[PDB]
Design a protein around this ligand. Structure first.
Ligand SMILES: Nc1ncnc2c1ncn2[C@@H]1O[C@H](COP(=O)(O)OP(=O)(O)OP(=O)(O)O)[C@@H](O)[C@H]1O
Ligand SMILES: Nc1ncnc2c1ncn2[C@@H]1O[C@H](COP(=O)(O)OP(=O)(O)OP(=O)(O)O)[C@@H](O)[C@H]1O
Ligand SMILES: N[C@H](CCCCNC(=O)OC1CCCC1)C(=O)O
Ligand SMILES: N[C@H](CCCCNC(=O)OC1CCCC1)C(=O)O
Ligand SMILES: [Mg+2]
Ligand SMILES: [Mg+2]
Ligand SMILES: [Mg+2]
Ligand SMILES: [Mg+2]
Lengths: 250, 250
């Protein structure tokens, strides 16, 4: 009569946040619901949450005067050392000289330096894309995730302006937050949505940067987790197991 | 007086397709032009070609009834073997059990199988994203590229329908092509834009697929190369060296 832990685990896979003994009937009910959810997505919008969020965020920053960057995901291992990373044990190495980027900063540093030769002050850029870190199991971490990093360099690089961009950005997405403060974290309850920095910092010199700057990095899967009230960030990930938070194991 | 080969190489970095002794003046002219090009992008649209193309392609397929997939880039090595790949020497391995995906097929096979339990016939899906292959130097190949793979499974999986989708798709993008024919290549002159397949094929059984299907895979950087008349596909890649085909080394 009482559901086993394994049965409960199975039902929880099929349970969605907005949902409101014997196991087989409960399972059948949830299977029907989830099939109908996929059918509705297929019939109507057909957009993947992670893709759609990237597009929405892209529009926000492009509209605010930030240049869209698409830089390599596979980066030189040298960039890790040059980032002052002696995270060191979290790097996915590829061949002898490369790794999967654990963050967007090194390529954006290079872009800021290069673009400063061409673009008027201030320089405003952003990137959204895959980042990789070896992580311990956890409901808030993925080994394959998607970062947004925006930054501004030159005039107007104040904490006030950084907080303003963050605030406008999250109010646009409709995500509740608190900024907890040079360095700031953007929190949703106890979940970190972003780390933000008001530069300059001593690392800049290694990258040929000698101007003020502000920037922040956000995990898109974390944003989705909060927005859609997913219990586990796995529902928001690139996945074969979940589609828009709906189990594909039906 | 005569430009050296190295000087010509430098000028060719700065030359754009639409452009129409002494070296320093030629260099200065091209530098000014390319800075102005970046300034215009920054002032006006601010979109990255590779990002924008992905968005345009996404809209095309979503509008045509195809479900947008975002699946893992880091995939089990087992998937390679299960794809009948004994390309074998082109795989970027990561740790003991994983690799960077060289193609979108294995994850899409899994999606087709899973979605067949939920969605009405025919099942139409697509993915756009990073793929990785170790390649010899060449003007048409990147080690890090972006694939579009669409497919349909069930009813209507005919060569005629596959050719129709391809034709509508490339006429939409404004890319000239010829389809050269079960299996088809979509050519732009001697450059392969896509390989396409009319299933079923014997590989399907390994992935739990036993329905007719059609599908095709396109390289986005190749599409950009053709569309923008880039001499080298490096101008279309995720890069720190080129932005929308414009040298960042100014
Ligand atoms: N493994 C991960 N999975 C999902 N999102 C991540 C992961 N690592 C970082 N992020 C996201 O990227 C943002 C910026 O990266 P940062 O390096 O500041 O993370 P972090 O300080 O290591 O986070 P945490 O303390 O939660 O590990 C984080 O605020 C988070 O939103
Ligand atoms: N290394 C690469 N760089 C850029 N695009 C690629 C690369 N490999 C494949 N593609 C693109 O992906 C498409 C489908 O992949 P497929 O495995 O059929 O390529 P392929 O037959 O190996 O191509 P090629 O003969 O040019 O190496 C190709 O038609 C091409 O547009
Ligand atoms: N790099 C991640 C995310 C931090 C985002 C804030 N930093 C930031 O925007 O750096 C700018 C990007 C290129 C150099 C300046 C971290 O280590 O927390
Ligand atoms: N996989 C690449 C691209 C081929 C694209 C055509 N194949 C295709 O769409 O396969 C479908 C995708 C999942 C299984 C059926 C190749 O090896 O050529
Ligand atoms: Mg961390
Ligand atoms: Mg942090
Ligand atoms: Mg090849
Ligand atoms: Mg081919």
């Amino acid at each position: 009569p009482a559901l086993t832990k394994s049965q409960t685990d199975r039902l929880e896979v099929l349970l969605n946040p907005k949902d409101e003994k014997p196991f087989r009937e409960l399972e059948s009910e949830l299977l029907s619901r989830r099939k109908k959810d996929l059918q509705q997505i297929y019939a109507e919008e057909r957009e993947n949450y992670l893709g759609k969020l990237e597009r929405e965020i892209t529009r926000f920053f492009v509209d605010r005067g930030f240049l869209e960057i698409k830089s390599p995901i596979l980066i030189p291992l040298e960039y890790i050392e040059r980032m002052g990373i002696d995270l060191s044990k979290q790097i996915f190495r590829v061949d002898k000289n490369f790794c999967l980027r654990p963050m967007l900063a090194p390529n954006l540093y290079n872009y800021l330096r290069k673009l400063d030769r061409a673009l008027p002050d201030p320089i405003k850029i952003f990137e959204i894309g895959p980042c990789y870190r070896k992580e311990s199991d956890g409901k808030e971490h993925l080994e394959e995730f998607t970062m947004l990093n925006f930054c501004q360099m030159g005039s107007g690089c104040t904490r006030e302006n950084l907080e303003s961009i963050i605030t406008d950005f999250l109010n646009h997405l409709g995500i509740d937050f608190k900024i907890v403060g040079d360095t700031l974290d953007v929190m949703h309850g106890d979940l970190e949505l972003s780390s933000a920095v008001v530069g300059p910092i001593p690392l800049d010199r290694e990258w040929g940067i000698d101007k003020p700057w502000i920037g922040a990095g956000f995990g898109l899967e974390r944003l989705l987790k909060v927005k859609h009230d997913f219990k586990n960030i796995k529902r928001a990930a690139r996945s074969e197991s979940y589609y828009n938070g709906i189990s594909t194991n039906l």
